[PDB]
PDB file of C-alpha atoms in Angstrom:
ATOM      1  CA  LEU X   1     104.610-187.085-104.839  1.00 41.54           C
ATOM      2  CA  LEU X   2     101.792-186.082-107.862  1.00 41.08           C
ATOM      3  CA  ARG X   3      99.575-185.192-105.574  1.00 41.30           C
ATOM      4  CA  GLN X   4     100.930-182.405-103.941  1.00 38.25           C
ATOM      5  CA  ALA X   5     103.073-181.761-107.199  1.00 39.81           C
ATOM      6  CA  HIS X   6     100.240-181.602-109.146  1.00 36.48           C
ATOM      7  CA  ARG X   7      98.953-178.606-107.387  1.00 36.65           C
ATOM      8  CA  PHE X   8     102.279-176.803-108.621  1.00 34.14           C
ATOM      9  CA  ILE X   9     102.545-177.842-111.703  1.00 36.16           C
ATOM     10  CA  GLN X  10      99.149-176.146-112.415  1.00 35.73           C
ATOM     11  CA  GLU X  11     101.026-173.179-111.204  1.00 38.05           C
ATOM     12  CA  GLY X  12     103.590-172.659-114.404  1.00 39.69           C
ATOM     13  CA  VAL X  13     106.330-174.301-112.250  1.00 37.94           C
ATOM     14  CA  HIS X  14     108.632-176.530-114.093  1.00 38.90           C
ATOM     15  CA  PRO X  15     109.078-179.796-113.405  1.00 34.36           C
ATOM     16  CA  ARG X  16     112.619-180.211-113.778  1.00 32.95           C
ATOM     17  CA  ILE X  17     112.554-177.674-110.576  1.00 31.61           C
ATOM     18  CA  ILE X  18     110.659-180.450-108.896  1.00 31.52           C
ATOM     19  CA  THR X  19     112.479-183.201-109.368  1.00 35.11           C
ATOM     20  CA  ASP X  20     115.887-180.985-108.599  1.00 34.52           C
ATOM     21  CA  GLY X  21     114.037-179.601-105.377  1.00 36.96           C
ATOM     22  CA  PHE X  22     114.091-183.755-104.559  1.00 38.11           C
ATOM     23  CA  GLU X  23     118.055-184.351-105.174  1.00 40.05           C
ATOM     24  CA  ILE X  24     118.432-181.678-102.928  1.00 42.12           C
ATOM     25  CA  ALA X  25     116.191-182.650-100.146  1.00 40.56           C
ATOM     26  CA  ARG X  26     117.488-186.534-100.667  1.00 46.54           C
ATOM     27  CA  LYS X  27     121.002-185.366 -99.486  1.00 45.00           C
ATOM     28  CA  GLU X  28     119.990-183.931 -96.336  1.00 42.05           C
ATOM     29  CA  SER X  29     117.836-186.272 -95.291  1.00 41.92           C
ATOM     30  CA  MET X  30     120.968-188.228 -95.655  1.00 43.84           C
ATOM     31  CA  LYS X  31     122.563-186.276 -92.784  1.00 42.90           C
ATOM     32  CA  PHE X  32     120.018-186.292 -91.151  1.00 44.95           C
ATOM     33  CA  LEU X  33     120.060-190.120 -91.336  1.00 43.50           C
ATOM     34  CA  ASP X  34     122.658-190.548 -89.734  1.00 45.58           C
ATOM     35  CA  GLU X  35     121.801-188.544 -86.634  1.00 43.74           C
ATOM     36  CA  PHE X  36     119.059-190.220 -85.643  1.00 43.53           C
ATOM     37  CA  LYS X  37     119.806-193.508 -86.290  1.00 44.79           C
ATOM     38  CA  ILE X  38     120.912-195.698 -83.248  1.00 47.51           C
ATOM     39  CA  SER X  39     123.423-198.757 -83.109  1.00 46.54           C
ATOM     40  CA  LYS X  40     122.851-201.948 -81.987  1.00 46.22           C
ATOM     41  CA  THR X  41     124.582-203.779 -79.941  1.00 46.95           C
ATOM     42  CA  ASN X  42     125.570-207.260 -81.448  1.00 47.93           C
ATOM     43  CA  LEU X  43     125.945-209.330 -78.330  1.00 46.07           C
ATOM     44  CA  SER X  44     123.475-211.861 -77.862  1.00 43.42           C
ATOM     45  CA  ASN X  45     121.490-210.680 -74.279  1.00 44.12           C
ATOM     46  CA  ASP X  46     118.986-208.374 -77.305  1.00 41.37           C
ATOM     47  CA  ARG X  47     117.319-210.895 -77.993  1.00 42.64           C
ATOM     48  CA  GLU X  48     114.646-209.846 -75.690  1.00 44.13           C
ATOM     49  CA  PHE X  49     114.400-206.914 -77.085  1.00 41.62           C
TER      50      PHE X  49
ATOM     51  CA  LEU V   1     113.297-213.413 -90.239  1.00 39.79           C
ATOM     52  CA  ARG V   2     114.819-211.409 -92.829  1.00 45.12           C
ATOM     53  CA  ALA V   3     113.623-208.544 -90.497  1.00 45.09           C
ATOM     54  CA  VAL V   4     115.864-209.790 -87.967  1.00 45.22           C
ATOM     55  CA  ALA V   5     118.240-210.824 -89.362  1.00 42.85           C
ATOM     56  CA  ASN V   6     119.507-206.864 -90.999  1.00 46.77           C
ATOM     57  CA  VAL V   7     118.974-205.783 -87.000  1.00 44.85           C
ATOM     58  CA  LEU V   8     122.612-208.474 -86.982  1.00 42.36           C
ATOM     59  CA  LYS V   9     124.210-207.709 -89.797  1.00 42.48           C
ATOM     60  CA  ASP V  10     123.648-203.701 -90.090  1.00 42.37           C
ATOM     61  CA  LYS V  11     123.370-202.394 -86.515  1.00 41.42           C
ATOM     62  CA  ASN V  12     121.628-199.268 -86.611  1.00 41.92           C
ATOM     63  CA  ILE V  13     117.829-199.677 -86.228  1.00 43.03           C
ATOM     64  CA  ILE V  14     115.144-197.038 -86.684  1.00 43.93           C
ATOM     65  CA  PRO V  15     112.197-196.471 -85.005  1.00 45.86           C
ATOM     66  CA  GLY V  16     108.794-197.243 -87.035  1.00 47.77           C
ATOM     67  CA  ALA V  17     105.558-196.172 -86.084  1.00 46.76           C
ATOM     68  CA  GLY V  18     106.180-192.705 -88.418  1.00 47.08           C
ATOM     69  CA  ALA V  19     108.553-191.409 -85.718  1.00 46.50           C
ATOM     70  CA  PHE V  20     111.019-191.099 -89.390  1.00 48.90           C
ATOM     71  CA  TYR V  21     109.000-189.680 -91.597  1.00 51.64           C
ATOM     72  CA  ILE V  22     107.226-186.603 -89.627  1.00 50.44           C
ATOM     73  CA  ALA V  23     110.138-186.145 -87.509  1.00 52.45           C
ATOM     74  CA  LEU V  24     112.348-185.625 -91.003  1.00 53.15           C
ATOM     75  CA  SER V  25     109.169-183.794 -92.232  1.00 51.43           C
ATOM     76  CA  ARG V  26     109.647-180.978 -89.576  1.00 50.35           C
ATOM     77  CA  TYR V  27     113.507-180.956 -89.911  1.00 53.60           C
ATOM     78  CA  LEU V  28     113.801-179.730 -92.969  1.00 52.93           C
ATOM     79  CA  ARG V  29     110.982-177.066 -93.596  1.00 51.48           C
ATOM     80  CA  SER V  30     112.500-175.203 -90.873  1.00 49.26           C
ATOM     81  CA  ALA V  31     115.855-175.284 -91.923  1.00 46.29           C
ATOM     82  CA  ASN V  32     115.050-173.965 -95.021  1.00 44.48           C
ATOM     83  CA  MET V  33     114.299-171.308 -94.243  1.00 43.23           C
ATOM     84  CA  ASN V  34     117.665-170.973 -91.479  1.00 44.26           C
ATOM     85  CA  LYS V  35     120.056-172.007 -94.935  1.00 43.54           C
ATOM     86  CA  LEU V  36     118.576-170.326 -97.873  1.00 43.53           C
ATOM     87  CA  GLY V  37     121.589-171.634 -99.317  1.00 41.59           C
ATOM     88  CA  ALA V  38     119.446-173.711-103.078  1.00 39.85           C
ATOM     89  CA  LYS V  39     116.963-171.596-104.693  1.00 39.36           C
ATOM     90  CA  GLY V  40     114.189-169.435-104.591  1.00 41.12           C
ATOM     91  CA  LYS V  41     112.216-171.827-106.564  1.00 40.59           C
ATOM     92  CA  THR V  42     113.731-174.706-104.403  1.00 39.22           C
ATOM     93  CA  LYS V  43     111.408-174.179-101.829  1.00 37.71           C
ATOM     94  CA  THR V  44     108.009-175.575-103.831  1.00 39.95           C
ATOM     95  CA  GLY V  45     110.242-178.964-104.062  1.00 42.12           C
ATOM     96  CA  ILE V  46     111.140-178.799-101.201  1.00 40.98           C
ATOM     97  CA  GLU V  47     107.949-177.716 -99.128  1.00 41.60           C
ATOM     98  CA  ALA V  48     106.314-180.434-101.461  1.00 42.64           C
ATOM     99  CA  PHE V  49     108.873-183.651-100.469  1.00 43.64           C
TER     100      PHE V  49
ATOM    101  CA  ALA U   1      96.945-166.776 -95.582  1.00 46.23           C
ATOM    102  CA  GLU U   2      97.834-168.518 -99.613  1.00 44.14           C
ATOM    103  CA  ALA U   3      94.217-167.841-100.883  1.00 42.51           C
ATOM    104  CA  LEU U   4      94.491-164.149-100.818  1.00 42.14           C
ATOM    105  CA  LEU U   5      97.828-164.639-102.590  1.00 44.33           C
ATOM    106  CA  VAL U   6      96.163-165.182-106.002  1.00 43.53           C
ATOM    107  CA  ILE U   7      95.474-161.661-106.216  1.00 46.80           C
ATOM    108  CA  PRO U   8      99.427-160.903-107.019  1.00 47.14           C
ATOM    109  CA  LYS U   9     100.161-163.898-108.686  1.00 48.91           C
ATOM    110  CA  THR U  10      97.245-163.061-111.275  1.00 48.92           C
ATOM    111  CA  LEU U  11      98.206-159.948-112.036  1.00 51.40           C
ATOM    112  CA  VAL U  12     101.547-160.768-112.820  1.00 50.94           C
ATOM    113  CA  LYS U  13     100.053-163.917-114.206  1.00 58.65           C
ATOM    114  CA  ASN U  14      97.763-161.857-117.004  1.00 60.06           C
ATOM    115  CA  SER U  15     101.135-159.992-118.457  1.00 58.18           C
ATOM    116  CA  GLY U  16     103.198-162.828-119.002  1.00 57.84           C
ATOM    117  CA  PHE U  17     105.784-162.667-116.446  1.00 59.08           C
ATOM    118  CA  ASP U  18     106.350-165.826-114.289  1.00 56.38           C
ATOM    119  CA  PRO U  19     103.940-166.030-110.944  1.00 57.80           C
ATOM    120  CA  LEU U  20     107.003-168.089-108.930  1.00 58.04           C
ATOM    121  CA  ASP U  21     109.905-165.330-109.508  1.00 57.93           C
ATOM    122  CA  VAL U  22     107.211-162.529-108.637  1.00 56.25           C
ATOM    123  CA  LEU U  23     106.472-164.996-104.981  1.00 55.85           C
ATOM    124  CA  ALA U  24     110.772-165.608-104.346  1.00 58.45           C
ATOM    125  CA  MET U  25     111.595-161.964-104.797  1.00 60.06           C
ATOM    126  CA  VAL U  26     108.742-160.323-102.492  1.00 61.87           C
ATOM    127  CA  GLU U  27     108.991-163.300 -99.583  1.00 63.27           C
ATOM    128  CA  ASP U  28     112.795-162.952 -99.575  1.00 61.77           C
ATOM    129  CA  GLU U  29     113.111-158.738 -98.764  1.00 60.42           C
ATOM    130  CA  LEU U  30     110.609-159.094 -96.057  1.00 60.71           C
ATOM    131  CA  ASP U  31     112.910-161.382 -94.356  1.00 59.63           C
ATOM    132  CA  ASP U  32     115.788-158.368 -94.373  1.00 56.73           C
ATOM    133  CA  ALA U  33     113.769-156.007 -93.091  1.00 58.17           C
ATOM    134  CA  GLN U  34     113.112-156.952 -89.846  1.00 57.46           C
ATOM    135  CA  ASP U  35     116.850-157.876 -90.032  1.00 56.41           C
ATOM    136  CA  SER U  36     118.079-154.034 -90.911  1.00 54.70           C
ATOM    137  CA  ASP U  37     115.256-152.978 -88.441  1.00 56.88           C
ATOM    138  CA  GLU U  38     113.310-150.553 -90.720  1.00 60.83           C
ATOM    139  CA  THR U  39     109.834-150.266 -91.750  1.00 61.50           C
ATOM    140  CA  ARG U  40     109.671-151.777 -96.219  1.00 62.12           C
ATOM    141  CA  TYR U  41     107.125-150.552 -98.762  1.00 61.11           C
ATOM    142  CA  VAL U  42     107.326-153.456-101.020  1.00 62.61           C
ATOM    143  CA  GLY U  43     105.980-153.599-104.103  1.00 61.89           C
ATOM    144  CA  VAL U  44     104.821-155.290-107.026  1.00 60.29           C
ATOM    145  CA  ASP U  45     106.724-153.981-110.957  1.00 60.53           C
ATOM    146  CA  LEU U  46     104.465-155.065-114.050  1.00 58.13           C
ATOM    147  CA  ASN U  47     106.663-152.869-116.051  1.00 59.80           C
ATOM    148  CA  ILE U  48     109.701-154.496-115.188  1.00 57.39           C
ATOM    149  CA  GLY U  49     108.844-157.926-113.172  1.00 60.60           C
ATOM    150  CA  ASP U  50     110.712-157.229-109.702  1.00 58.54           C
TER     151      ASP U  50
END
């Protein structure tokens, strides 16, 4: 992540906006995480799985 | 033993082999253009993430 | 496409204006031009910065 941000640092981008944009994307990733996850049953027939 | 124990305790499972990383990277890229509810300079942090 | 952006980026950089700000305002203006269905010519202003 520092390598991808290195290109923006040399252009004059302040690191706070770089870090603030990560927290916004982190909160949006949690919303996609709830839809992407799959609930697995507690039943004991999953030994094959 | 701990990876299997987490499946029984936590009923949620996620596929590996880069399934979550590729799907999340493509989703956040196309969603930032439709939302546009953060800031113009935030696009640098979202694209880098 | 990103290599041609150096000309508008370094043009406002020598004047002291933030090159990241001009890229955000112009890009947001071109998106609203297609929604209104009209031809809009956008260019950089070195004195004001917008």
